[PDB]
Design a protein around this ligand. Sequence first.
Ligand SMILES: NC(=O)c1ccc[n+]([C@@H]2O[C@H](COP(=O)([O-])OP(=O)(O)OC[C@H]3O[C@@H](n4cnc5c(N)ncnc54)[C@H](OP(=O)(O)O)[C@@H]3O)[C@@H](O)[C@H]2O)c1
Ligand SMILES: NC(=O)c1ccc[n+]([C@@H]2O[C@H](COP(=O)([O-])OP(=O)(O)OC[C@H]3O[C@@H](n4cnc5c(N)ncnc54)[C@H](OP(=O)(O)O)[C@@H]3O)[C@@H](O)[C@H]2O)c1
Ligand SMILES: [K+]
Ligand SMILES: [K+]
Ligand code: NA
Ligand code: NA
Lengths: 313, 313
Amino acid sequence: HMDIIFYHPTFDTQWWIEALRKAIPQARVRAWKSGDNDSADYALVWHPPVEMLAGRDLKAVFALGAGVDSILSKLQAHPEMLNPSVPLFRLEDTGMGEQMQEYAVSQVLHWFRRFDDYRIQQNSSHWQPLPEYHREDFTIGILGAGVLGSKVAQSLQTWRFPLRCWSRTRKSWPGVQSFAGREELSAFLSQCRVLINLLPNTPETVGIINQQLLEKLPDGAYLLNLARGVHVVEDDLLAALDSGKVKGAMLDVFNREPLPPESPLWQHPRVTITPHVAAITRPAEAVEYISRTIAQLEKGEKVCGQVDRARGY
Amino acid sequence: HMDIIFYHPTFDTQWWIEALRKAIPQARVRAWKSGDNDSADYALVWHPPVEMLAGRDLKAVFALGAGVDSILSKLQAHPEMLNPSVPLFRLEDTGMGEQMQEYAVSQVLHWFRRFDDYRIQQNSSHWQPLPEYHREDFTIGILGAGVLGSKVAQSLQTWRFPLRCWSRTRKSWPGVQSFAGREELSAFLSQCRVLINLLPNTPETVGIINQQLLEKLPDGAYLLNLARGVHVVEDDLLAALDSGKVKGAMLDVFNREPLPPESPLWQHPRVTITPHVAAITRPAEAVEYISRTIAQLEKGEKVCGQVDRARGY
Ligand SMILES: NC(=O)c1ccc[n+]([C@@H]2O[C@H](COP(=O)([O-])OP(=O)(O)OC[C@H]3O[C@@H](n4cnc5c(N)ncnc54)[C@H](OP(=O)(O)O)[C@@H]3O)[C@@H](O)[C@H]2O)c1
Ligand SMILES: NC(=O)c1ccc[n+]([C@@H]2O[C@H](COP(=O)([O-])OP(=O)(O)OC[C@H]3O[C@@H](n4cnc5c(N)ncnc54)[C@H](OP(=O)(O)O)[C@@H]3O)[C@@H](O)[C@H]2O)c1
Ligand SMILES: [K+]
Ligand SMILES: [K+]
Ligand code: NA
Ligand code: NA
């Protein structure tokens, strides 16, 4: 027997309640409204109001996404929102791994096969085979080597691209050179023909993709930002695009979302924009992960997917 | 000890001669010029002149490509060109399998993730997440289930797309529904959200992708022509593009190559054009396949990659 409160600003609240009741039949599930101060054991939230969590000794909070920077930043401004005793969980993969693989593999191959060059030539009705690129010149670097970074690396390794990753701690993936810490970031960047960003938004990573980082990439590099918009200094990226340093950039996330129409990114020739749809939360897989995690918590089984509030992700 | 004559209209003749001499050190290799009637054991050819092969009792001819429709059509017009005793071989895979996989996986995922829709929206600086497509609605059909068709099917199966193939004879690939013969072509087409053409050019397949075939596809279908241009009736494809039957078409081959500038395909919004570069012949891999095949022929080992002239491919 448990009480679950649910909040999401836009999802189909009623669908989630019913799906949760089926997956956890002993649970009483309700949508949280302002003024609801009744007891609750678990909270499933996205962009929760401070009032929903403040003062509650919850058994756990589940953030309905892979990123938790919005909740953590709100907790920094409102420390009363989440008691330190409450463990905070996020969605680990739950289908977002495959979605990132689809996105990254498609576009890496797109660039590797020079479909962007052939499109420019097609615009002028110009027929001209181009020299093929070689894998030895197409090392792919993944900023962030976590749940999603590892999935993307694995899918690209299938295609025999040289691979490297960057994180805080060393990784052991065969065939993927692991770089760790700011002290190794420059060496990491020196060979990244394609740079894929899958970092979390933390104070230590804000603005990391800036002029100083971009200039260390090889010439004709490609940028794939699948993480958070604050990671990229957009005016620095535009300068690197205009100078020829970056041959192409595909961006799914931006400092302001929706991306304002005045942004030069919309109409820049070498920029491809998707409206933050790289890896969406699939309700059925999220319900399965949450219900399974709750069962593991009840059985005392060690669990994965817990946020370290001191660490920031 | 053997004599090899080499002809290619555009490749680096001298590089090929030297590479062949290294791979087959007992071989005397020479570029064929008009008037060269000296003896030869093997001929490596692409678009060979009739004079090069006529009257020669060669041990084998190796066509320097996967398709042999140009040689077979020339032999039909000049039956004296190749004695019936001469076995004819083509390049089987030799790296073209992976190239077709790169091409097909990239573009299938491109369409599956609606990057074409997001690009149209980006042209207007319009931010709008779109509903995701589902694999159950994205059955991929492969016209031609051969060396390259099987490789493409295998790579797409990795991504959990429903798969079917069409050929003359039944296939046994687990998870891929095999359709065989014209009598099953209509049933094959009925579910193909994406149609990938990897057929050979033969009299039995010319013009197969026409109005009658396209109308049997599901609405919003996609066409990927990686095979030969004569397979597609281009005015029928344009009509299906203008009516909304076909959502997108990516074409690497055309009835006339280079594609004349007057073709409406160049500037049609839903058409993507590459200049016959889907899977190019890589000299080093071709030299390895040819030298290995010759050794197998000398040892009496059963060989693959032989053209059936009565069959047409
Ligand atoms: N639609 C979308 O665009 C979409 C969807 C889902 C997620 N995302 C984004 O993708 C991000 C990654 O998700 P995930 O599940 O892969 O997260 P994760 O498993 O926590 O992985 C985070 C990785 O970043 C590394 N990292 C963090 N801070 C660092 C620093 N200061 N220096 C170097 N490396 C650092 C971590 O290194 P260690 O391994 O050493 O800890 C870890 O490898 C999310 O935070 C979210 O913002 C975007
Ligand atoms: N850059 C490029 O665009 C590029 C590069 C390389 C090749 N290609 C093209 O790709 C083609 C395929 O090469 P491949 O090595 O895969 O050839 P393959 O191994 O001979 O495969 C041909 C397939 O087509 C099927 N087929 C032939 N005639 C048919 C008919 N009348 N009805 C139904 N099915 C039929 C065959 O069926 P069975 O299996 O029953 O015999 C076979 O499965 C080449 O011929 C070439 O034109 C293009
Ligand atoms: K901007
Ligand atoms: K045309
Ligand atoms: Na209710
Ligand atoms: Na010479």
